[PDB]
Amino acid sequence: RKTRHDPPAKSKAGRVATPPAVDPTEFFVLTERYRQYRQTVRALRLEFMSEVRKKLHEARAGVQAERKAQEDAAEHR
């Protein structure tokens, strides 16, 4: 690509982006599905964050980790 210190081209210096044609009956029914899908994926992301928290707590202060942490010191003594 270009750089921050490179000037733009002359063919696009005086160029503005143009939007395409918009179909309202399709755009609205697509935006509503967009929202219904984004809420679902947000809920799934929250579920995955909860699973990650559960696994991290099981790995930090788990009932399986404490047993080893105690039995190793016992055998050491």
Partner: protein, 190 residues
């Protein structure tokens, strides 16, 4: 080759036993090279059209030797009876075009039980066989599945309200497109 149908007949014929005998076909063949060590790459192709490239290969010198996956006595001469490996081209003395075909014929014969090879003893894939898990068994269908409804109600095409249609058309003036209602259920063919 008069046979052209049974390559193994020549190996049992008399004109083979008096020429080669109990010795392999590459017994008296010696390949020339440049110094004390022959090259790691042998001749690519020894027969170009009708001309023979000087000293022919042990297989290519007598046209009655047909490379085929049926006559296993010929292919056995190129596989060590102890290690079961394939003899390489510098070891045999044949051209590469015939060595690749010999490797293919050996593999095809091993894939047909004609040529023996090592078969290791392999334990079963799974330690325990459990057909009760929900991976291979049937799962209780959803109430929306047994009813014939999509998994999500917003999967179907719903008609937006006329007020929302007008609100969109008021803001998207200039770029307005032809309207289109619900799409057909089944797509026809050509």
């Amino acid at each position: 080759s008069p046979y052209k149908d049974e390559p193994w007949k020549y190996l049992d014929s008399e004109e083979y036993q008096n020429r080669y005998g109990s010795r392999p076909v590459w017994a008296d063949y010696r390949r020339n090279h440049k110094g004390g060590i022959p090259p790691q790459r042998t001749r690519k192709m020894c027969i170009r059209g009708n001309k023979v490239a000087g000293n022919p290969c042990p297989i290519c010198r007598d046209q009655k030797l047909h490379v085929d996956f049926r006559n296993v006595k010929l292919l056995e001469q190129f596989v060590c009876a102890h290690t079961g490996i394939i003899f390489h081209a510098p070891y045999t003395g044949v051209c590469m075009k015939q060595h690749k075909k010999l490797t293919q014929a050996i593999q095809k014969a091993r894939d047909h039980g004609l040529l023996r090879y090592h078969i290791p003893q392999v334990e079963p894939r799974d330690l325990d066989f459990s057909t009760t898990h929900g991976a291979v068994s049937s799962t209780p269908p959803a109430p929306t599945l047994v009813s014939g409804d999509p998994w999500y109600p917003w999967y179907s095409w719903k008609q937006p309200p006329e007020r929302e249609l007008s609100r969109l058309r008021r803001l998207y003036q200039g770029r307005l497109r032809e309207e289109s209602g619900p799409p057909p259920e089944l797509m026809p063919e050509v």
